[PDB]
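Colleagues,

Please find the record for the three-part complex below.
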Amino acid sequence: TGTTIKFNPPTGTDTMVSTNISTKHQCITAMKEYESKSLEELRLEDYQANRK
Amino acid sequence: DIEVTSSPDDSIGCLSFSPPTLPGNFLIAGSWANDVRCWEVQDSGQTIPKAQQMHTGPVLDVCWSDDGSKVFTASCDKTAKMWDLSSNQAIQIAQHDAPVKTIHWIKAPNYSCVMTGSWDKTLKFWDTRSSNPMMVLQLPERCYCADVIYPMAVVATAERGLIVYQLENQPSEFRRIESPLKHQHRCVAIFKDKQNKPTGFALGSIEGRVAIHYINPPNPAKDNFTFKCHRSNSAPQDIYAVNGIAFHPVHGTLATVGSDGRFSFWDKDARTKLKTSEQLDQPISACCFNHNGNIFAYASSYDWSKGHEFYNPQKKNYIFLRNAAEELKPR
Amino acid sequence: DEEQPMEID
């Protein structure tokens, strides 16, 4: 409940057009711990807990 | 780009211009300071703060009534209000069991109502005068985004839900669609055909990816496609989230705003990237067009994309207006 | 800037 766990951009792989590249994902809900809630949901919880 | 005078004090989440039935142009904005604000936009770009109303929770979506006399609000206080503008009175017309994420006005040839999509996994319809919802529809998850163009409505939910509704006579489900994106749904917008009839929609995820989906294309394997966007780049490519998507009302082309602080214009028929802007000091949260497409508005605010550690309560929240409809003209 | 073709999958 809330963004209590620190942000860590998950890593991945992909191609681009024609080569192979690596990727960092700059969204907190892309991590496993926040994959079940949205950005507005996490933000709303940090507000009600006075964690601004 | 030109700023809007007296912008809200916190992050903006929604924008909405006035209908054509009103003379001139007017802009509505909702912020995480639980406030709703209005600006009269002059032809020269000068913006005049006209009125303001407040919720007890952050406002997540706003829209206008068809005749231009009302403005509807959706807040995290599980309610939704109707705001008569000539009298400057805002009363409650909607109630939910969870924050309200989407709000839309439905002008049918046989009824007219307000639709509310909330995180309580439901979808209610209000007649703006009775405390009971005239119809309640069930969603399999929390509501994340929606859009309404008669006779078609599209709603995206959590767990990558995707449902299309028919609106003739009364709203009901048309089809549940397997999502063409494999990440969290975020924003959606409906586009029309050459005969001005709704035909498909554009879906955006948090993975810098936007999907184009037609309802009944002749060859869906080649007609429906997905394209990358809002990714800043031998070296790793940063993937940012799509926070908003809207179509130009005259040229049929689309714009997109993302957590990368940039906004891009796209053509889905020719499948080409028209423009990409500079990197703003903070992500772009919302955007919309005016009634004739000559004004493109976009708000620069924090989106909680990197968590609470990256929220700076003193960075100024800006709303920008761009008088460029020809950057979206196809060739 | 100038027109570019879409990066489509």
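Residues 2-328 of chain B form a domain with the Methylamine Dehydrogenase; Chain H fold (CATH 2.130.10.10).

Comments are welcome before we finalize the supplementary table.
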